Amino acid sequence: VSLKKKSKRRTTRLRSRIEKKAAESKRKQK
Amino acid sequence: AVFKNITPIPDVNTFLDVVLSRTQRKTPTVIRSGFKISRIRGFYGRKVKFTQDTITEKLDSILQEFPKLNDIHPFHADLLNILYDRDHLKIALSQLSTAKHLVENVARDYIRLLKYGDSLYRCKQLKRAALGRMATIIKRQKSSLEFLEQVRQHLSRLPAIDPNTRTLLVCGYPNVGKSSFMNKVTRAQVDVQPYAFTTKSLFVGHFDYKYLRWQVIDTPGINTIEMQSITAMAHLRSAVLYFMDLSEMCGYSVAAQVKLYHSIKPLFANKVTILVLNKIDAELLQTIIDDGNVKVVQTSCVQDIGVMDVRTTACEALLAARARPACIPDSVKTRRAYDANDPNRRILARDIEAANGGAGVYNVELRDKYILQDPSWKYDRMPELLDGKNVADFVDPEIEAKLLALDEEEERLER
């Protein structure tokens, strides 16, 4: 059983949005 | 003036934490950017308003619970003067009220700007700008809140005085037997110690005599304690109970006590003082005796002799200044009063009860005490109805005779 309050599995928009904005973070720190 | 009913004042940090925690817990928490701008504005407006309401609610509670020094009996007002510096207390209370108005002004200002919030963020910071200003306002009265809490704690300790009632103020030299007289007269447990000025503050104790209750107020011996003692007798319809050490066993000279009493006579005027000769068992006094109002009653403090007589004399002085043959049964003339400890005392139904299960379980037998030719039938059931008639309508001690008379009559009719 999950035994959690928040699901450990992520949606495809959410997982795609990390690589969208993680790269921009490296752009900003550059 | 029971000053115990004042709610306890939190320090500035707990006050802010309680207010902010209440705002978080009692108001809605979740909002999304996609919501209508009216709902966003209303959302943050509620938090600012709710936080304003919690702060004033607490601050008003302080401002109302504290006693208004001007509206109270000048005995207590001057007592609060010597202890708390009315000006400092008044400044502290005014600072909170000025804070309260400031908390209201900031909230009204930020609610007004929130009506024009265009994005979820610009409302978010007005709320953050709001609550921070509300908090920074409160943080500035750290001294005032701390001061009021200390005042609160000592206020709850003060005795509940009532100058309206009959009183008898007891003042004199420190540890000069006044504490012993107060302890012997009133039920108050006044501590007696070799240390001088053991009674730091006043001690009020009630005493019942002459079908009335008198509130004897013992004052500090004679500083702040001396000032409080003076103000205690300053405004009080009572009589002085000065106790002078006759044998000087209290450590104070008799002449010094007489001189102090003469100096304090200006405030002790319009009262019937007492020239108590304390420590009797253990010249200058002529001038004091020349006043006449002082009652020269010997007080054998070591032997505890004369305390009751002195108290009775003081109470009397204060009061002055302010055919049907009842056939009682013979058993009544020799009835032993029901006192529990004695063995000869009979039992009561209360004791039968605690033995037989106590309140709610014991069934009292109502029938158990019937005057009756037998104790056995004492639980019988008397027939009430029979064949449409009550048995009661027919209960007659000679009813057998009416039945026999009748027999003869029916025997006549059949014949």
Binding site: - | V361, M382, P383, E384, L385, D387, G388
Partner: protein, 365 residues
């Protein structure tokens, strides 16, 4: 969005489904816990709701607002003729539950209990239990073997008893047969008690004793299909859930009234059963003109407080309370003062015709 004005739920979720009971006879879904410290005793009885009346009793309730006053209470009268024990069932405890290992029947079975096995007694050739009677007469050693099996392996002993419905003034001829668990004693003791009680009648005088607290269980009156108004007390896109009140069956559900007090266990052969120490006035529990829609009570009867589920002439099961509960209401004695037996078929005004005749004039008839 939240509900603005809230109220408690209009129904009870613990009593649904509101479907018709699959039985007419009250089922015992729980028998009182057994104990070997106490030897044998029964735990249930089967009666018929004749009718209900009201009584006056002196209330000896310590601490009450009406301590030692005369109180009026409604009472239900259930006729309880003695029931004949005709069988014993052994139950073995298994990791899957209580399982009926075997059953032993008495040799002579009355037509009362034989009618239970048929939907039409007249067309049948009455062949039931005939070969069982033959083998009982031939060899009793076989029957001794099943009883040995019951007392050796089984952990719960129950007796099959049927009510003598013939004695009651009921138009039904089938007897109601049920199992009463023999609580108390060892399994051998229960088996013996069943053996010496075969074919003999056990009466309510031996089951209950006029003061204890019992659970009365039965099927309620049928009100037919009803809308949400009287079935349930009713004043986002989704699908309708089970919690939403709906229209359907109202009535004829299996119910259990707890904590019923017997005010009196009267004997049918006695003619003083409706008379008390404060009343005299020889009378019977049957009201003047007979019970409405039931008849005349001529056998042993039980008078319970309050009301019991189901209409008149329906079968009720009376079981001993599962759990001891020593509320002083459950522990106090009862001393009846007066019982009402006026005509319930209308506004009755007289208790018995005898005492009505003195008040009324000489009727021409």
């Amino acid at each position: 969005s939240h509900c603005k004005f809230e109220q408690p739920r209009h129904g009870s979720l613990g009593f649904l489904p509101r479907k018709r009971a699959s039985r007419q006879r009250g089922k015992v879904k729980a028998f009182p816990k057994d104990d070997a410290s106490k030897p044998v005793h029964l735990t249930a009885f089967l009666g018929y709701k004749a009718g209900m009346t009201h009584i006056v009793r002196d209330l000896d309730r310590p601490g009450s607002k009406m301590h030692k006053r005369e109180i009026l209470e409604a009472v239900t009268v259930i006729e309880t003729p003695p029931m004949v024990v005709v069988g014993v069932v052994g139950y073995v405890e298994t990791p899957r539950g209580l399982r009926s290992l075997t059953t032993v029947w008495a040799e002579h079975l009355s037509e009362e209990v034989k009618r239970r096995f048929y939907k039409n007694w007249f067309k049948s050739k009455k062949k039931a239990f005939t070969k069982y009677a033959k083998k009982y007469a031939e060899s009793t050693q076989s029957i001794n073997r099943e009883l040995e099996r019951i007392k050796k392996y089984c952990s719960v002993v129950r007796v099959l008893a049927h009510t003598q419905i013939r004695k009651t003034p009921l138009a039904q001829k089938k007897a109601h047969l049920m199992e009463i668990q023999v609580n108390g004693g060892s399994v051998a003791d229960k088996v013996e008690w069943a053996r010496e009680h075969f074919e003999k009648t056990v009466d309510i005088k031996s089951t209950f004793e006029q003061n204890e607290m019992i659970d009365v269980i039965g099927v309620t009156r049928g009100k037919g299909n009803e809308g949400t108004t009287a079935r349930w007390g009713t004043k986002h896109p989704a699908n309708v859930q089970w919690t939403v009140a709906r229209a359907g069956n109202a009535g004829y559900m299996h119910r259990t009234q707890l904590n019923s007090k017997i005010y009196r266990i009267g004997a049918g052969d006695d003619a003083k059963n409706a008379s008390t120490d404060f009343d005299a006035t020889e009378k019977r529990i049957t009201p003047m003109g007979g019970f409405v829609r039931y008849g005349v009570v001529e056998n042993d009867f039980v008078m319970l407080n309050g009301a019991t589920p189901g209409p008149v002439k329906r079968v009720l099961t009376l079981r001993k309370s599962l759990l001891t509960h020593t509320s002083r209401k459950a522990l106090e004695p009862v001393s009846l003062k007066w019982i009402d037996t006026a005509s319930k078929f209308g506004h009755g005004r007289f208790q018995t015709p005898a005492e009505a005749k003195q008040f009324l004039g000489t009727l021409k008839k």
